[PDB]
Design a protein around this ligand. Structure first.
Ligand code: AKG
Ligand code: CL
Ligand code: CL
Ligand code: FE2
Length: 277
């Protein structure tokens, strides 16, 4: 297979620092890039959670999360889920982290939320959207008011599926921590392997970002991606930012010189992407 050549960025004093302005433009136009993991941020507990959560109460300290199914939350989409592909997941929105996750996992989630916030604001500035529209345009993610899922993934190599079939993420921005081969992206109609680099996150955009920016100078895309069939197990985890969803408003497209036009609801966007994706 092809291997994607990705731009690398780091968080600095003025948001995202790519190598130069040209690289930033390639990165945002491709819809995927690498983000250097801050040296102070500890990912070891998250890594361990992704390796354990599916294993049940015999396995300490995280296997017990296997038992918190969807029926424990009111929200069908949270807790432990076996998927149709090799993937199984544990997903939790931020309003539940403090009560439900281990304290050190909630900490990791909070750090990733603030890191994702900085990345998103750097992207919004590059899109030419006026700053006073950012909070509504981002469904709260330009501050700390969005919906945030910290989601743990395990690929059951004993299952005869693709690892995770082709899809685009919901939401605005995904910060993905992966340390093993498997992720593939359809950059320019060709499937390419994402090179492994455990010192970087993989960052891409979701469908809400694509809708938002479709009329800008450089429309941004929610990149189609998948995880190939795994012959041996694999795990990963990701931080996913989407619009606030308190039972108000919904999903916007930015029109240069005019402001924000509502396209649909927060609800209808996720439930509709759940199927054909
Ligand atoms: O596990 C991976 O590398 C990708 C996971 C992913 O694409 C997702 O959870 O939406
Ligand atoms: Cl299982
Ligand atoms: Cl399966
Ligand atoms: Fe994804």
């Amino acid at each position: 297979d092809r291997t994607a050549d990705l731009e690398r960025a780091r968080l600095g004093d003025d948001g995202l620092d790519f190598q130069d302005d040209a690289a930033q433009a390639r990165a945002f136009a491709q819809g995927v890039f690498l983000l250097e993991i801050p040296e102070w941020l500890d990912l070891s507990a998250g890594d361990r959670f992704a390796r354990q959560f599916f294993q049940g109460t015999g396995v300490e300290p995280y296997g017990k999360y296997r038992d918190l199914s969807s029926e424990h939350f009111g929200d069908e989409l949270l807790g432990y889920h076996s998927r149709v592909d090799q993937l199984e997941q544990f997903l939790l929105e931020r309003r539940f982290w403090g009560e439900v996750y281990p304290s050190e996992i909630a900490t990791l989630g909070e750090h990733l939320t603030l890191l994702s916030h900085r990345v998103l604001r750097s992207v919004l500035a590059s899109a030419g959207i006026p700053e006073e529209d950012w909070h509504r345009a981002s469904g709260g993610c330009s501050e700390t008011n969005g919906s945030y899922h910290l989601t743990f993934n395990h690929y059951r190599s004993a299952h005869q599926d693709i690892g995770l079939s082709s899809h685009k993420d919901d939401g605005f921005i995904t910060v993905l921590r992966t340390t093993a081969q498997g992720l593939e992206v359809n950059r320019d109609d060709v499937w390419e392997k994402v090179p492994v680099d455990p010192a970087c996150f993989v960052v891409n955009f979701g469908l809400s970002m694509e809708i938002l920016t479709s009329a800008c100078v450089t429309p941004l895309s929610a990149i189609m991606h998948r995880v190939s069939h795994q012959n041996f197990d694999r795990s990963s985890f990701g931080h996913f930012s989407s619009s606030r969803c308190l039972p108000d408003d919904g999903i916007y497209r930015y029109l240069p010189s005019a402001g924000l036009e509502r396209v649909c609801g927060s609800r209808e966007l996720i439930e509709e992407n759940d199927h054909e994706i």
